[PDB]
Design an enzyme around this catalytic site. Sequence first.
Site, PDB file in Angstrom:
ATOM      1  N   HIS A   1      -7.583  -5.697  -0.764  1.00 21.01           N
ATOM      2  CA  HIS A   1      -6.392  -4.941  -0.449  1.00 21.01           C
ATOM      3  C   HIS A   1      -6.016  -5.297   0.985  1.00 21.01           C
ATOM      4  O   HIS A   1      -6.912  -5.316   1.845  1.00 21.01           O
ATOM      5  CB  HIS A   1      -6.775  -3.461  -0.485  1.00 21.01           C
ATOM      6  CG  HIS A   1      -5.624  -2.529  -0.321  1.00 21.01           C
ATOM      7  ND1 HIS A   1      -4.575  -2.483  -1.214  1.00 21.01           N
ATOM      8  CD2 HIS A   1      -5.355  -1.606   0.631  1.00 21.01           C
ATOM      9  CE1 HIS A   1      -3.706  -1.571  -0.814  1.00 21.01           C
ATOM     10  NE2 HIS A   1      -4.160  -1.020   0.297  1.00 21.01           N
TER      11      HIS A   1
ATOM     12  N   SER B   1       0.821  -1.215   0.000  1.00 18.47           N
ATOM     13  CA  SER B   1       0.000   0.000   0.000  1.00 18.47           C
ATOM     14  C   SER B   1       0.858   1.270   0.000  1.00 18.47           C
ATOM     15  O   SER B   1       1.662   1.467  -0.911  1.00 18.47           O
ATOM     16  CB  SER B   1      -1.006  -0.025   1.153  1.00 18.47           C
ATOM     17  OG  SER B   1      -2.106   0.841   0.886  1.00 18.47           O
TER      18      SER B   1
ATOM     19  N   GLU C   1      -9.024  -5.738  -4.974  1.00 23.13           N
ATOM     20  CA  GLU C   1      -8.532  -4.637  -4.139  1.00 23.13           C
ATOM     21  C   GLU C   1      -9.657  -3.772  -3.576  1.00 23.13           C
ATOM     22  O   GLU C   1      -9.672  -3.469  -2.377  1.00 23.13           O
ATOM     23  CB  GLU C   1      -7.587  -3.748  -4.947  1.00 23.13           C
ATOM     24  CG  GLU C   1      -6.280  -4.406  -5.359  1.00 23.13           C
ATOM     25  CD  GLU C   1      -5.216  -4.325  -4.270  1.00 23.13           C
ATOM     26  OE1 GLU C   1      -4.143  -4.933  -4.456  1.00 23.13           O
ATOM     27  OE2 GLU C   1      -5.447  -3.647  -3.232  1.00 23.13           O
TER      28      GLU C   1
END
Length: 566
Positions: free
Chosen positions: A467, A214, A347
């Site tokens: 994610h 990230s 995600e």
Amino acid sequence: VSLMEKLKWKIKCIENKFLNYRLTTNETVVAETEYGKVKGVKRLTVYDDSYYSFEGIPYAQPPVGELRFKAPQRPTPWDGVRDCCNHKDKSVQVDFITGKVCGSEDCLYLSVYTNNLNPETKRPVLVYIHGGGFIIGENHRDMYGPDYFIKKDVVLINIQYRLGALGFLSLNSEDLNVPGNAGLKDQVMALRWIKNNCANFGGNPDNITVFGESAGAASTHYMMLTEQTRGLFHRGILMSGNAICPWANTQCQHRAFTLAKLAGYKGEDNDKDVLEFLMKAKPQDLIKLEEKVLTLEERTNKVMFPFGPTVEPYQTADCVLPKHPREMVKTAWGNSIPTMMGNTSYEGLFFTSILKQMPLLVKELETCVNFVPSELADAERTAPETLEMGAKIKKAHVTGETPTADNFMDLCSHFYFWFPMHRLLQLRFNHTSGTPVYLYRFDFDSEDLINPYRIMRSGRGVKGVSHTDELTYFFWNQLAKRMPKESREYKTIERMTGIWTQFATTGNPYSNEIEGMENVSWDPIEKSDEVYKCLNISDELKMIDVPEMGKIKQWESMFEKHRDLF
């Protein structure tokens, strides 16, 4: 966060304290560092492995008092033996679970782990930079335990860096020496420490891999883009992010005044007066109010964070981002080291909690105007050209006549992750020596083993690989448990740490010693490729064309008449 999860978390926090203590060992040991000797301690894992642990190694001066908002300076060295048998505080931040500010300005530390302090051979060194949008995160082992990686013969190092306004305030006035990117500069300093000290822990100074997820991926990319870090490492892994993601940089020079104003500043909008107020405010008051800084317009335009990486308005000694990341890609030293990049198979699932609180957001997909790349769209997002750009997005993600939450989340996968990756790959291709880039797609779904961000995304009992879901198979966290050796989860731990170690070692992620990979022929992406291929990681390991390629090309079509901006 719910009271339910708050009480569960508090109980796990207590359980983690007792487990941490009982997994502690009496075997203290001393290592050299250029700043003086450090004492670490061996620890245990729930899989009956063990590793040496050095935490709270300073890589910079504590950025307190006058050092606030300023570039890091090197720490003062010490006589004797500095105790590194316990962790230090995390960077000041809002605890995503309690909702309270925790942490300390005194946070510039790194932790070093290895199963063997005197290896007969120098080992690959892996450096993890945590994500958390540049506003949360830590190197504490309740979140990023090295327990899985230390079954491998590597040195793993986990760094911290300043978050939020404390890390990313930026002021135009050159007299004040607050150009921005203090937190990225912290990372630079940490990499310099690692380069010149890893050998003391059995690490190979000439074989270092940086990786992050990230905002940690954006960070790793920045470290590959900036001239400050040239030759400091030899491989990079970008997990669910990079520097040209729209959330990865913001021009935030005007927002300092706003923050000061929220914090009770009385006076005018000038940098000098604004800084002197911000310098005297309590750190926890500034971080607490950070959430209110963005205007309604900014949020509508999908600006995600008020302070983050920025183009610095003037060039100082420790300047990291002197130009927009897109331009930096054109001469980046990092284009020429072996690179791996990837994303999870869903995600956008991460935005479930956001959609639950703001279901009106789904209506944005009626025109998709708010998701047109900000550089292409007009301020009000009412221009007919932005209407037609948004229409291209809409066809790519809207499934019926009215859009759904799933359409929204699928759109989010591309806007936040896949499209920027595409733009980076194509940009990078016209400025590279020819070093390989490999793509993976993380597609392994389980709820038998999880990590804390599942609480944050309200993802309990939600199918799909969101994610952050991959972190579970790389790091121990305080919600983890020992898994049977034949479980699909345990095998995914072996495969993920195995693939990452192989890549860190050779610059090639393929190994036949990794179970499941026996038929894998994993080639790098070439400039002449119209379609990306990736290793899809699920219960089986399989090379496939990226399923997302079609929607990716559609997003690219928005730049038909603006090819220069692609």
